[PDB]
Amino acid sequence: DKNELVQKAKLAEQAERYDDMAACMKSVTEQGELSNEERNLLSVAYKNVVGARRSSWRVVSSIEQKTEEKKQQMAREYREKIETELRDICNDVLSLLEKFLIPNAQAESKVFYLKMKGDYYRYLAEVAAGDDKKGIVDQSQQAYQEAFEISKKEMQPTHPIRLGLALNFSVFYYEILNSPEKACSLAKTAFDEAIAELDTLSEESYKDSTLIMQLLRDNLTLWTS
Amino acid sequence: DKNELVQKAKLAEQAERYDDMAACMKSVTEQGAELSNEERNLLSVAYKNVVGARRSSWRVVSSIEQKTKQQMAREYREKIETELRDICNDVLSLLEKFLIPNAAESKVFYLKMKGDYYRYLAEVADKKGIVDQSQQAYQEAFEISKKEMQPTHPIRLGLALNFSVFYYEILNSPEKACSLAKTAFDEAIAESEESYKDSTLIMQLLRDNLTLWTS
Amino acid sequence: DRSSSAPNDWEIPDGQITVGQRIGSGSFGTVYKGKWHGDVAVKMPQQLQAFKNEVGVLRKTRHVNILLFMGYSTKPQLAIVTQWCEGSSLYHHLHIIETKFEMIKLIDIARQTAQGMDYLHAKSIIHRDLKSNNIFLHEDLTVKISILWMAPEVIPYSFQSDVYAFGIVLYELMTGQLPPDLSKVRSNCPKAMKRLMAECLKKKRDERPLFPQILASIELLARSRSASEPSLNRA
């Protein structure tokens, strides 16, 4: 089963049948720690599912602003109908981690889990509005904060997810909290530390470090606007 | 009513959420609506996108099994394959029930669709007793269309292009495809121009089609 | 836009061109990076004779498919200036990074070399030192025109001695691995390309084809996927 589940997952991944990946990996997670490679598949799977569920939402929202008419009914209904799909998708991954994140402490595994928990809240926060968004925004900042603490103390700057976590924390502050310096200071701190760490000898850390770090400067540059 | 559906379809098309387009376009056509080029185009684009990804997936899926848990690979193929048939058989029923009676470019394209969608279905195969209907569909459409639109028209060339690739991909008999392909080139090259910009791509495609079939 | 996320006259007076940081060495000497209305490349009695002899041969090139020479320098030291090439040599691409080249481009790499050498040959320019360490993939694979790669008779140059080296290019293009073991040739190589590589290793030096024949041969062989009609047009 688990082997086959991974196999169905790995094969469905090849099939890009991400819709099916969600059902397989959810059921996989339901068994309750998730191994490294096995954990990776879930993140990419739901991210791809949410991706389609987010890019569409983005274009349709723009279209609504552009729409100004009968279109307002169709657009708003459609936007709402796509929002309820992602939120159920959101509550699902949240429910899975809410249950199976607990078996985690391997500190980076716990670190990985909190990062994952914070990210989807932002997706949820984008589609929500008003007080509904406030409730999730609160949980989101707290999740990144708790993640940042353990990641900062227990994970060295060569760890790729430590850098990616800071990136997610910073993009949330910039995109919603609208405080570029609050995001820039932390993100650049990792960046400054990561470039110092570029001197490390390990090839994989080096490979993963150069791959991720490229986003940081133009991102901060884009945030100068 | 249909206008509401047309709008929704227009939305799902660009938002990369093709599943909604088919259901909405189905409601318009099942009501008995008459489709103009852009009206049918949306329908054509909706189902063509929807079926291509699964079939391409099957191509991916069906290739890994060749590399041979083992049963599971075949089983997964059968699932997408099973779904791939159902999702297209819906269109055949709709075509047969409503789009066939629809009534010359209209019939040409709808007849074209029958063979087209039938091609996508039969290739999944049984096959011996299936493919001939697409052959029949294409022959009728080509025979009827030959007198209605000039070869430069992209529908005819698109029809001819599919009609040509059909013999090669359905049973690997390149002799008719290559002859068919070149047969249209000179009358198309000889020349209404609003969509000729599109015609040149199909023309180029057929020439490029011709380029591979040389081997 | 919005923030991204985690995806998972040919004499140039001295002083006009800024010669910057030293990058490396070529077949002989030192190659430096430079600036003049964009990036430029600068290559630094025996010294003067070697410079004029190499410069004089290089001075005959005026074509888009050859590493573009731009000028020469006498101050503070004798320097030969060409345009800058960004990337790595064919050897580095093929042997340290395992560069993933498209088949059409692999055939095209052969096409550009014969065109450049034919042009050079029309100007009576003998290459004498063709090899993967001397072949830079400029920008999007644009071709700009040895102990292990120098032909047995050369290692005395003639049209056929230079051709032998291009024969080795066919080997490198089809095998991709360090020596050469021809068994590494790719499975999808067109038979005509497969045979030409084998032909290039023929024992008789005078049996090698002329550059007009190679270019014409590449034009003929170059002709060597079918699919369904694309979605109809919409704005």
Per-domain residue ranges for chain C?
A: 18-83, 90-221
> Would the annotation count C51 as a binding residue?
no
Among the listed residues B144, B213, B215, the one whose alpha carbon sits nearest the alpha carbon of residue B180: B213
Across the interface, whether the CB atoms of A219 and C8 are under 8 A apart is answered no
Phi-psi region of C139 (alpha: psi -120 to 50; beta: other; left: phi over 0): left
Across the interface, whether the CB atoms of A222 and C8 are under 8 A apart is answered no
- Rg of chain C over all Cα atoms, to the nearest angstrom: 21
> Would the annotation count C73 as a binding residue?
no
Across the interface, whether the CB atoms of C224 and B44 are under 8 A apart is answered no
Residue B185, exposed/middle/buried by CB under 10 A (0-12, 13-18, 19+)? middle
**Catalytic, out of C39, C129, C140, C181:** C129
Using CA atoms of B62, B65, B69, B73 in order, give the dihedral in degrees to the nearest 10: 10
Those chains having 3 or more beta-carbon pairs within 8 angstroms of chain C are: A, B
In terms of CA atoms, which chain A residue is nearest residue C3? A219
B59 secondary structure, DSSP code: H
Across the interface, whether the CB atoms of C4 and A215 are under 8 A apart is answered yes
Among the listed residues B126, B131, B116, B129, the one whose alpha carbon sits nearest the alpha carbon of residue B51: B116
CB-based contact, C3 to chain A, within 8 Å: yes
CB-based contact, B23 to chain A, within 8 Å: no
Distance CA C222, CA B110 (A): 40
> Would the annotation count C167 as a binding residue?
no
Distance (Å) of CA A1 to CA A12, A14, A42, A103, C102: 15, 19, 17, 21, 40
| Burial letters B111-140, b for 16+ CB under 10 A, else e | bbbbbbbbbbbbbbeeeeeebebbbebbeb
Distance CA B207, CA C194 (A): 26
Among the listed residues B166, B152, B161, B160, the one whose alpha carbon sits nearest the alpha carbon of residue B199: B152
CB distance A16 to B57 below 8 Å: yes
What backbone phi and psi angles, to 5 degrees, belong to C226? -75, 140
Those chains having 3 or more beta-carbon pairs within 8 angstroms of chain A are: B, C
Distance CA B36, CA B57 (A): 32
Across the interface, whether the CB atoms of B195 and C233 are under 8 A apart is answered yes
* Close Cβ partners of B139 (under 8 Å, ≥ 6 residues apart): none
CB-based contact, B7 to chain A, within 8 Å: yes
Collapsing DSSP to helix, strand or coil, C142 comes out as: strand
Distance CA C21, CA C23 (A): 6
Residue B44, exposed/middle/buried by CB under 10 A (0-12, 13-18, 19+)? buried
Percentages (nearest 5) of helix, strand, coil residues in chain C: 35, 15, 50
Q: Is the C-alpha dihedral spanning B109, B111, B114, B115 positive or negative?
A: negative
> How many other β-carbons are positioned within 10 Å of the β-carbon of residue C192?
15
C230 secondary structure, DSSP code: P
CB distance B102 to B33 below 8 Å: no
Using CA atoms of C182, C183, C184, C185 in order, give the dihedral in degrees to the nearest 10: 70
Among the listed residues B199, C2, C211, C216, the one whose alpha carbon sits nearest the alpha carbon of residue A171: C2
In chain B the domains, ranked by start, together with CATH numbers, are 1-215 (1.20.190.20)
Beta partners for residue C137, in sequence order:
C143
Provide the terminal-to-terminal Cα distance of chain C, rounded to the nearest Å.
23
List, as own/partner pairs, every contact residues C8-12 make where C-beta atoms lie below 8 angstroms and the sequence separation is at least 24, other chains included.
Answer: C8/A40, C8/A43, C8/A44, C8/A47, C8/A164, C10/C59, C10/C69, C10/C70, C10/C71, C11/C71, C11/C72, C12/C36, C12/C70, C12/C71, C12/C72, C12/C73, C12/C81
* Close Cβ partners of B85 (under 8 Å, ≥ 6 residues apart): B121, B124
CATH class of the domain at C90-221: mainly alpha
Q: Which two tokens stand for residue B109?
A: 């394209």
Among the listed residues C229, C150, C145, C73, the one whose alpha carbon sits nearest the alpha carbon of residue B203: C229
CB distance A119 to A176 below 8 Å: no
CB distance B111 to B147 below 8 Å: no
Cβ-Cβ contacts under 8 Å, A70 against chain B: 3-4, 7
> How many other β-carbons are positioned within 10 Å of the β-carbon of residue C231?
13
Which residue type sits at B129?
G
Across the interface, whether the CB atoms of A3 and B69 are under 8 A apart is answered yes
Distance CA C25, CA C44 (A): 10
Technique used = cryo-EM
Q: Which helix (H) or strand (E) holds C35?
A: strand C31-35
Distance CA A100, CA B151 (A): 64
What backbone phi and psi angles, to 5 degrees, belong to C72? -140, 160
> Would the annotation count C23 as a binding residue?
yes
CB-based contact, A15 to chain B, within 8 Å: yes
- C94 min Cα distance to partner chain A (Å): 20
C1 among known catalytic residues: no
Asked, as a colleague might, if the bond just before C76 is cis with ω within 30 of 0, I would say: yes
Between B154-171 and B174-189, two packed helices, what is the crossing angle to 10 degrees? 170
CB distance C98 to C176 below 8 Å: yes
Distance CA B92, CA B162 (A): 17
CB distance A150 to A189 below 8 Å: no
Q: Which fold does the domain C18-83 belong to in CATH?
A: Phosphorylase Kinase; domain 1 (3.30.200)
